[PDB]
Design a protein around this nucleic acid. Structure first.
Length: 72
DNA sequence: GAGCGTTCAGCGTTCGTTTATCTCCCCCTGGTATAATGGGAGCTGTCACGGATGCA
């Protein structure tokens, strides 16, 4: 349990647990530029909380493709 | 010589020794007889550089 001043007294020593900043799960769209192509490239990636991740990259060489856990 | 005075003596006399017997638990091995028949699982995002290595 946590006392009234927000510290966990474990084994006679006062600990504190600090908050932690993490990337929230969801879809994120990133735009980039390929120097060889001379044109913008767009990607999508859905990063879940627990499962394997999935990506959807468009116009790498003018076609759209999917990475199922980046297997192939 | 009397009476006792020092000091080897070798000899017993069992007590001294170290050395020989003899009784016991951890430790290792083997065996169970309905039927049972291909894993969970943890990831992921730096950055540049280069050279090997694949493939249109």
């Amino acid at each position: 349990l946590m006392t009234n001043k927000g510290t966990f007294v474990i084994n006679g020593t006062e600990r504190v647990v600090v908050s932690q900043l993490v990337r929230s799960p969801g879809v994120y769209f990133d735009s980039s530029i390929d120097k060889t192509s001379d044109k913008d490239i767009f990607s999508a990636k859905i990063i879940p909380s627990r499962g394997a991740w999935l990506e959807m990259e468009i116009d790498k060489r003018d076609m759209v493709g999917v990475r199922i856990d980046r297997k192939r």
